[PDB]
Amino acid sequence: QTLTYDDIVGTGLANKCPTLDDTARGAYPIDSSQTYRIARLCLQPTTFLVKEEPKNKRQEAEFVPTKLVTRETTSLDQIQGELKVNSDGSLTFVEEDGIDFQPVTVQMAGGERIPLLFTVKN
Amino acid sequence: GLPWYRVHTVLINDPGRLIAAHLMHTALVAGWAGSMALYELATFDPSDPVL
Ligand code: CLA
Ligand code: CLA
Ligand code: CLA
Ligand code: CLA
Ligand code: CLA
Ligand SMILES: CCCCCCCCCCCCCCCC(=O)OC[C@H](COP(=O)(O)OC[C@@H](O)CO)OC(=O)CCCCCCCCCCCCCCC
Ligand SMILES: CC1=C(/C=C/C(C)=C/C=C/C(C)=C/C=C/C=C(C)/C=C/C=C(C)/C=C/C2=C(C)CCCC2(C)C)C(C)(C)CCC1
Ligand SMILES: CCCCCCCS[C@@H]1O[C@H](CO)[C@@H](O)[C@H](O)[C@H]1O
Fold it and tell me: Is A11 left (phi over 0), alpha (psi -120 to 50) or beta?
């Protein structure tokens, strides 16, 4: 029942991050003496907003919608890194490697194209 | 012969060609409206309806 490449190729699922059941409302214990890592971090963008640039700097600018024109090529995935337990009990993720960038072009109303390097590098 | 300012009077007793002339005029006016709108769209800046 596990899906293979040929089940997935061309469907768009390859650009989608995994989801968890609605039953996944638990808790993962952290032992401050154990070391941890994130074996896989996946980020799937669903919305790109671009801040408009107004002529009068008194007017507050807003984020407007855009149309993605570079197809299902946007997600960051296979990202891994150390997950530190800090002395105050907080956790710090330190990204080390992975597919941690995607060039993306979105288009504003009126046709202006906005390329960006969607990323979480370092 | 007809002087230059009377050439179109040949339509007076020709209903079919009068319709043809009226059709042609209608085509030119509708074509102007389309051309005019396209030219405006090529020049219109939509980014500031305030100023
Ligand atoms: C609505 C427009 C229109 C229509 C439906 C008619 C219809 C008619 N004309 Mg008339 N005519 C018109 C406008 C029109 N004319 C204009 C503007 C002029 C001055 C040039 C004339 C001068 C004229 C003469 C001398 C004669 C007719 C005649 C006739 C009849 C036969 C067709 C013909 O020979 O045309 C003639 C051909 C034209 C008028 C072509 C006009 C070209 C225009 C001015 C330029 C268009 C070029 C291009 C598309 C745009 C340039 C843009 C620029 C930025 C480069 C027919 C009833 C004939 C007739 O039956 O007489 C008894 C005839 O001898 N017309
Ligand atoms: C619906 C409006 C309309 C219609 C269907 C007509 C139709 C006619 N007119 Mg009349 N006329 C009109 C309005 C109209 N006119 C208006 C508003 C005026 C005052 C300007 C006149 C003054 C007038 C005179 C003094 C005469 C006519 C004559 C005629 C007859 C022959 C025209 C001809 O062959 O010209 C051919 C025209 C050309 C070959 C070139 C004309 C070029 C003009 C001057 C400049 C360019 C015009 C431009 C291309 C068009 C855009 C127009 C738009 C902005 C309105 C024909 C029945 C004649 C007649 O009675 O014959 C027996 C005649 O002597 N008309
Ligand atoms: C009862 C049916 C009927 C209908 C529906 C019309 C309608 C029209 N006639 Mg009139 N007419 C009629 C009876 C009718 N007439 C009779 C019995 C006579 C005596 C023979 C006339 C003599 C007459 C003359 C001399 C002229 C008209 C013109 C016009 C048109 C002016 C508006 C225009 O061009 O808009 C712009 C056009 C549109 C928005 C397109 C509309 C969709 C079209 C009508 C589809 C055409 C398909 C159809 C199968 C073709 C035949 C149409 C015909 C039955 C009217 C309009 C379509 C004028 C004209 O044709 O100018 C260009 C014109 O000069 N009529
Ligand atoms: C209600 C609206 C309306 C009316 C009543 C008319 C009426 C007329 N148009 Mg049409 N036209 C219209 C809207 C209208 N137009 C629109 C919105 C467009 C798109 C821009 C046109 C584009 C158009 C074209 C291309 C032509 C007409 C022509 C005509 C004339 C055909 C009958 C004729 O033989 O006159 C005889 C001519 C006259 C009576 C002369 C009228 C003079 C007008 C009123 C002022 C022009 C003065 C001055 C010389 C203009 C210089 C322009 C120059 C610098 C380029 C008639 C006067 C045709 C024409 O004039 O054929 C000769 C013609 O070729 N019209
Ligand atoms: C299905 C047909 C259709 C439709 C839905 C449209 C729709 C449109 N037109 Mg186009 N057009 C058409 C056919 C059509 N057009 C045809 C056949 C021509 C060539 C004649 C044009 C030439 C044209 C031009 C030149 C322009 C448009 C424009 C427009 C836009 C503004 C309309 C407007 O302000 O009208 C206003 C309409 C009136 C004020 C109607 C006046 C009616 C008079 C008063 C009637 C008087 C006689 C009547 C018999 C009296 C008795 C009435 C009785 C009830 C008592 C709108 C998108 C405008 C635009 O934005 O272009 C991009 C524009 O400039 N159209
Ligand atoms: C065909 C209709 C054209 C009329 C256009 C009139 C526009 C002026 C406004 C009305 C003034 C009224 C005076 C009427 C006086 C009057 O009643 O005349 C009436 C006359 C017809 O009268 P008749 O049938 O009795 O003819 C008398 C002839 O035998 C002459 O002797 O009409 C004309 O002459 C039409 C030509 C005028 C043309 C004027 C010059 C137009 C040139 C335009 C230049 C365009 C350049 C374009 C660049 C791209
Ligand atoms: C065929 C066909 C087709 C096509 C069509 C087309 C493409 C059309 C176009 C059309 C057009 C594109 C048109 C245009 C027109 C224009 C006009 C008509 C103009 C006129 C002008 C005038 C008249 C002016 C005058 C003046 C001057 C010049 C100066 C100032 C003053 C005054 C204003 C007086 C199709 C595909 C649909 C299909 C079916 C068949
Ligand atoms: C009916 C033929 C239409 C041909 C042109 C249709 C494109 S639509 C065109 O697109 C541009 C870029 O997005 C805009 O800047 C402009 O406002 C708009 O009119």
Answer: alpha
